[PDB]
Amino acid sequence: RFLKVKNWETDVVLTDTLHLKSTLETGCTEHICMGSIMLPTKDQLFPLAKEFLDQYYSSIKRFGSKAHMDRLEEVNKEIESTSTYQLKDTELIYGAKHAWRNASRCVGRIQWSKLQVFDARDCTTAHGMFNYICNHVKYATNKGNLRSAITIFPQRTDGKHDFRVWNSQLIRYAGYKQPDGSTLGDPANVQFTEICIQQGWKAPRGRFDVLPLLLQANGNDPELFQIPPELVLEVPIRHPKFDWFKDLGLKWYGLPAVSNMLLEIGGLEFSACPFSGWYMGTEIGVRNYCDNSRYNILEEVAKKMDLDMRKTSSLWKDQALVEINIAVLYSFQSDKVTIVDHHSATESFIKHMENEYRCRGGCPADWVWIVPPMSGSITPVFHQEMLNYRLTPSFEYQPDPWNTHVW
Amino acid sequence: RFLKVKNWETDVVLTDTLHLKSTLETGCTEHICMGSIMLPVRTKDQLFPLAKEFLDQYYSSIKRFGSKAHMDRLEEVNKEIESTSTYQLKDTELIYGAKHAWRNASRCVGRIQWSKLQVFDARDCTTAHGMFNYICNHVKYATNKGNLRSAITIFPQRTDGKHDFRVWNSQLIRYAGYKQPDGSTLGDPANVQFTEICIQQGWKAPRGRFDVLPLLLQANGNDPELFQIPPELVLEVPIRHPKFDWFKDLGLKWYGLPAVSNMLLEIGGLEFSACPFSGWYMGTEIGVRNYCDNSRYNILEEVAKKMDLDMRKTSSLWKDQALVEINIAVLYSFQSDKVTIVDHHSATESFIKHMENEYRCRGGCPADWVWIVPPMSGSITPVFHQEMLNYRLTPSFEYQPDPWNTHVWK
């Protein structure tokens, strides 16, 4: 019941006791592992609230205290009467930070305690949501010196007045399927891009068009808004040696801001909780640019580098891949925009894991997601065994709203 | 129950029904995933059912399920187990068994080749000298002057656990590792302990950077004995680069035949503790892991310097640049010397085709994503984007503790 994890490069062994607090299912069983699978009532609520509040008061060293007991009863009576309850600001902050701390797929959790939390629970309309969002983007961007932040909108009530940010991230590029049959822009956003058009947006039909926010407040139909262009920091991509690189016409936005996840704290569900930190280089250079279903620029770059693309064994794709990633990092650093390379980030994650095992008894981690998409084994996490389990507070996936909204 | 796996690059979705025949446990629970953990005598009682399951599978494979031949074999084996507490496989069953252990190996990306395995039956072997001869023959056949052929040599199964046949080497061919008084290592760090055992057993170590280790062979539970593999039988490739003439002066080379010799082959409940097998290398095994792991030859620095890369900051990605060149060098050298090798792009592409074929004709293909995805350029290979299901099917290859930790010395 006390599992051990070993690093096969340093031989360091850590013992995990934290996993014994996990409640939710992993998708795996004694017969089958689903580790590589992407997506594996008043009576229900109070126990969840109790679990959360107990961990909260324990964190502030007041477990068992009258305050602890008083709060517990207050919430209890609130659920019995209102069928729900409201978190204190302190509980909200502690909850959001811990949902990040518990995110097993995030390699940047060494930064978890520094999260800026924006309480938007007083929001009532989409226009109010737009305002809170612009403020988050401006705050988080900080002229290039990115600061992690989350903005939390009202919690779910009966499920028919949910607040939702239809976008997958606050800032993304549109995608349109052209006559040729090809795709212009980001193929990943082809569908969302049309839903925007399907009701208003006027697309420049470019390769890198910033999508408009489609905000849904109180269950009402979503409304479009253009993020003040001046608030969207973008970085033109060039290479520190290949002067022809800039000719590729490539750029990427500086703020990664997941906006479609669900934040669960003490049983409460916050369906609109956009958060942002900063990029790990490979996210852009390896995945966004080189995935065959994304901008898929490997061939173009290989051709400009004049590499023998006749055979796979010449490793031309690999050589081009490295160059594209050196460019991305070079470009962001040159424009003084925060970004971290996979070596540095993974090194920090190992440090974080050790801290967590020492001070918390463990660190849920998903190896499949933690190991960078390029040069896996030359990063320390590849050699690190990890135990994946679910702890709450948590960030969860949720269905795209267009597949559930009743207009 | 049907289980769906999706490929996030092509949106192709496959349905798995094969997992229903999984018996062994994975190490995971409905509460914790141990997907990245490296390692998470039978009774007459527990043996016939294991035998029955296997023979049922075997007979169904040859389209003779339920036949008189099928029923007689089951009766023959049952009587044999009741009578001797164990049983012997027919040559055909052993061949079928070995091929399927490979076919079921979740961590192997080269399984598109499974049906082509050459099985050498060494169950009549009784001594360590006998084992050496069988192993020499395996290496010569498999090497085939560079046109590698996959093969497996199978020694006598376990009986009471006190007469085990074991190849103490982790692979038939590996380089010695020597821990120096100053704390540094000469040779391959991965083999320091085994090298010390060899020396203690009498091996005269040339103490170089690439000394092929001698075989330490255990027959019938007796103490192991040392044998030197005929040098003329050990094919090696000097490593050089197509554009960098200084690469060759790094003094690197690697053996051409990868031959895992420490796993246990389980077939129909029987345990074959000595079953060396070989195929051929995927370049990253050598170029990424053996050469670039910090705990192995660790050559990234020396290579990076010679390329005059900016090593002042990791963000120059000098490690990644050097890495690619080293792997280019490994592939180029093997191809130049006409020694079979496969690059990670070709191997992963073939594995995806193999996997889809298996779903269609078999109902599944257990696969360990953590092991299948190559150690470099992960997402530019199709397997990175492929959801996999990992489960254990028998026949199978299993880990077993190193023999020096369990052997009762005589």
Ligand code: HEM
């Ligand atoms: C500040 C530095 C940060 C860095 C460098 C970072 C890096 C990463 C990376 C590289 C991924 C994988 C992304 C992908 O492949 O799609 C990721 C995933 C994730 N991160 Fe972090 N992160 C940071 C901040 C945050 C913050 C502020 C939160 C939450 C408040 C967070 C929550 C998550 C979650 C929940 C996932 C998994 C999302 C999914 O399943 O798609 N991260 N992070």
Ligand code: HEM
């Ligand atoms: C013919 C070409 C072959 C190729 C290219 C291939 C490639 C690989 C590679 C790249 C690995 C991972 C090795 C590591 O990282 O340590 C592997 C693992 C494995 N392969 Fe294959 N393989 C081949 C043949 C074979 C054969 C002949 C068998 C058995 C009859 C086999 C059984 C296995 C097993 C059981 C493992 C997992 C070993 C472990 O867990 O440590 N492979 N293979």
Ligand SMILES: N=C(NCCC[C@H](N)C(=O)N[C@@H](CCN)C(N)=O)N[N+](=O)[O-]
């Ligand atoms: N570095 C970050 N990267 C997040 C990148 C999100 C990723 N590009 C993405 O598309 N995620 C999908 C989920 C795909 N599993 C989504 N949020 O809809 N996050 N951050 O706050 O610092």
Ligand SMILES: N=C(NCCC[C@H](N)C(=O)N[C@@H](CCN)C(N)=O)N[N+](=O)[O-]
């Ligand atoms: N390509 C192959 N590669 C196998 C390479 C074996 C690997 N280098 C190794 O050291 N395996 C450990 C097992 C580590 N899990 C052992 N055999 O003791 N196999 N083949 O048959 O062609």
Ligand SMILES: C[C@H](O)[C@H](O)[C@H]1CNc2nc(N)[nH]c(=O)c2N1
């Ligand atoms: C199928 C497989 O789960 C999928 O391709 C995963 C693998 N690891 C990943 N890791 C990260 N960080 N991000 C991803 O999108 C993925 N995709």
Ligand SMILES: C[C@H](O)[C@H](O)[C@H]1CNc2nc(N)[nH]c(=O)c2N1
């Ligand atoms: C800790 C982690 O499981 C370990 O480093 C694994 C990862 N994937 C691997 N994949 C292959 N092919 N070979 C290995 O030795 C490993 N090591």
Ligand SMILES: OC[C@@H](O)[C@@H](O)[C@H](O)[C@H](O)CO
């Ligand atoms: O075009 C819409 C897509 O961006 C959307 O469906 C995402 O795939 C989804 O939000 C999960 O990332």
Ligand SMILES: OC[C@@H](O)[C@@H](O)[C@H](O)[C@H](O)CO
């Ligand atoms: O030097 C001994 C090692 O080669 C040996 O203990 C291996 O680690 C073991 O066979 C697993 O690979």
Ligand SMILES: [Zn+2]
């Ligand atoms: Zn699992």
